[PDB]
């Protein structure tokens, strides 16, 4: 029984091995703890928004949407329909990006390196969509607690449709390279098997729950923006191993394509942010023409809007699981407390149980199938 | 509605068993993967010839910060300090006083580019379009000190990039 | 794509599909990089009358949470937090993958 340290995403991992078996797996985290939750307390809500881009930095607009929903619930306002449709469309695009990153990185760690490039070309195209809509490729900060910052450019929808009509073939190529390969199945089948009750008690969410046969999805059971107006299927696993989670993620990519099609065909007209200048800033022309608009712009960009006192816990179906925010307001324009809930935290906490009686090479597969990004884990 | 991903039961008749045995012994799926890689080998790569070719960009895209001025030549900034107040990273430092002609102008306008997050909140908070985040992104530096911009550097950046900055603003100002 | 016909058939046979139908490199089918000016309509509160802010003030309608049995101050059927969730249906588009 020898103890060895896999030092430095960035992870320190302490194990004791009995030959090839993994006996204890003690992950050491905090190598990316930047004190985001304490820094948020010194910012206004608009100022605190860009932290959520950096929390789970593979799914940026999903964290933006979760924070915006929490602030909207505390403010007792609602975004316009077009803003909600844009939010859901870009959330599905973000889910596609996140699942591409997760699947290709998991394959790369095992030893399959070519689909990484194949699908990072598509990732670059989606980054182009992000840049066109917001001016930034990755740390977008586009989704706001009143809606979205800017309306879509006049040719974005056509390019999104053009991208979406060719992505299924890329998924097909990935499946041809991975799904029926016997080496991939030997690396993934019956690895990291977790029971439904254990997953529930360990705090798992998302694919980590659905691969064990638990029929749960926050977009279906607790819909938030317009998710009750779109139709899609929830992939369900049967064995609770890495292979079932891989299949579930591929199926979620296909269903995200389906939802993107529905969103493109049903984009409504109207404004993009709540028509309430005490929360959402006015237009530039109004600010440069009307006295009230200039006053409200000044106050919103210097002090920010005040949020009525209260505490809420708002969760969404993030591409990695249930992403939640426990937001506390004291009545001022700065949040009193902001606790950030990341599914990767619970998944990494369960990594120890998931790796009992497995090879040293299986822990890498379990880490890859858990979809761990340490920005959200450490915060 | 929900879907099953791994709920297929293999057939147990002699033909399907023989097919699976042939797959196991003759390595059919590995040949399929080899064929997929071979098919990718014969298509045009997605590589562009940097730096001679450039990646597509948009007017909205945020680049290096610049201080603009009116067509008459006077700087637009009036030292309202709204960008400094809104800056989520506290990257902007501003000091001001009345000018020799009594105008409200800055004497210090510093942006720490190693603290900036390039969010663009400052340019959307500015009421006179004085501070903008221009399209330049190739401004890497050999030392930390040259990334600490003062007012002279930002005014020089504005005078250097004004043509493209104004074109981008003309393209994008109807969405703001 | 500027690929010869022989290479086209070779790659089509190697992958086993028709690739020119769905190409992964953009061409003239994309939108123009110069676009006409937009108009961006206004919201519902842009009226000149019957538009008092007191009738559309979301923040001022928030109230402190309702108090249930503050401790310091019959049949009685048992209850649940919410009605039991209905079982899902088996996706009569592609039930099995």
């Amino acid at each position: 029984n020898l103890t060895l340290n896999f030092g430095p995403g960035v992870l320190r991992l302490v194990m004791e091995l009995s030959g090839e078996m993994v006996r204890k797996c003690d992950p050491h985290i905090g190598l990316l703890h930047r004190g985001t939750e304490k820094l948020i307390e010194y910012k206004t809500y608009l100022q605190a928004l860009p932290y959520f881009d950096r929390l789970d930095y593979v799914s940026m607009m999903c964290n933006e949407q979760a924070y915006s929903l929490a602030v909207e619930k505390l403010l007792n306002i609602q975004p316009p329909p077009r803003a909600q449709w844009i939010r859901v469309l870009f959330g599905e695009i973000t889910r596609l990006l996140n699942h591409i990153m997760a699947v290709t990185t998991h394959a790369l760690d095992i030893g399959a390196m070519t689909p990484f490039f194949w699908m990072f070309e598509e990732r670059e195209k989606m980054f182009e969509f992000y840049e066109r809509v917001s001016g930034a490729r990755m740390h977008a900060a586009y989704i706001r607690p009143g809606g979205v910052h800017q309306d879509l450019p006049l040719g974005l929808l056509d390019d999104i449709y053009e991208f979406s009509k060719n992505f299924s073939f890329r998924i097909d190529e990935l499946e041809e390279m991975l799904t029926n390969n016997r080496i991939w199945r030997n690396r993934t089948v019956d690895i990291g098997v977790v029971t439904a009750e254990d997953a529930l008690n360990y705090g798992f969410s998302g694919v980590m729950l659905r691969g064990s046969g638990i029929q749960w999805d926050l977009r279906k059971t607790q819909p938030y923006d317009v998710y009750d107006q779109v139709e899609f299927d929830v992939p369900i696993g049967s064995r609770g191993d890495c292979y079932d989670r891989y299949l579930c993620r591929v199926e979620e990519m296909r269903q995200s394509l389906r939802i993107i099609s529905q969103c493109l065909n049903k984009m409504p007209p109207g404004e993009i942010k709540v028509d309430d200048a005490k929360v959402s800033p006015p237009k530039r022309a109004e600010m440069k023409t009307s006295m009230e608009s200039l006053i409200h712009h000044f106050k919103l960009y210097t002090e920010g809007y005040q949020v009525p006192p209260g505490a809420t816990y708002t969760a969404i179906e993030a591409p990695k699981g249930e992403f939640g925010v426990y937001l506390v307001s004291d009545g001022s324009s700065r949040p009193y407390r902001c606790k950030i809930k990341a599914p990767g935290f619970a998944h990494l906490a369960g990594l120890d149980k998931m790796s009992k009686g497995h090879m040293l090479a299986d822990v890498v597969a379990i880490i890859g199938t858990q979809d761990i990004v340490f920005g959200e884990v450490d915060r | 509605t929900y879907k099953f991903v791994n709920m297929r039961e293999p057939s147990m008749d002699m033909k399907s068993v023989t097919d699976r045995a042939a797959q196991t012994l003759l390595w059919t799926e590995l040949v399929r993967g080899l064929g997929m890689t071979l098919s990718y080998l014969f298509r045009e790569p997605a590589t562009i010839n940097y730096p001679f070719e450039k990646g597509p960009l948009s007017p909205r895209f945020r680049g290096e910060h610049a201080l603009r001025r009116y067509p008459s030549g006077e700087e637009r900034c009036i030292a309202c300090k709204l960008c400094e107040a809104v800056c989520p990273a506290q990257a902007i430092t501003i000091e001001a006083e009345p000018r020799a002609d009594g105008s409200r102008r800055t004497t210090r306008y510093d942006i720490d580019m190693t603290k900036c997050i390039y969010c663009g909140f400052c340019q959307e908070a500015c009421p006179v379009d004085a501070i903008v985040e221009g399209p330049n992104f190739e401004f890497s530096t050999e030392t930390h000190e040259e990334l600490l911009y003062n007012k002279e550097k930002l005014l020089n950046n504005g005078d250097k990039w004004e043509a493209e900055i104004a074109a981008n603003i003309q393209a994008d100002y109807l969405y703001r | 794509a500027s690929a010869t016909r022989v290479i086209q058939l070779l790659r089509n046979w190697a992958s086993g599909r028709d690739l020119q139908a769905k190409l992964q490199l953009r061409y003239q089918e994309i939108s123009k990089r110069t676009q006409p000016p937009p108009k961006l309509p206004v919201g519902p509160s842009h009226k000149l009358s019957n538009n008092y802010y007191c009738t559309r003030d979301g923040r001022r309608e928030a109230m402190p949470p309702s108090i249930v049995m503050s401790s310091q101050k019959t049949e009685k059927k048992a209850v649940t937090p919410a009605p039991p969730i209905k079982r899902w249906e088996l996706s009569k588009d592609q039930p099995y993958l």
Partner: peptide, 29 residues
């Protein structure tokens, strides 16, 4: 005078988007 102009789907909507898995069977018994 000028009417509203913003990014909208074309009249009649977009064409269908393929999303189902397509892994064909080549053929050898």
């Amino acid at each position: 005078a000028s009417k509203v102009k913003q990014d909208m789907p074309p009249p009649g909507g977009y064409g269908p988007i393929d999303y189902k898995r397509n892994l064909p069977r080549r053929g050898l018994s």
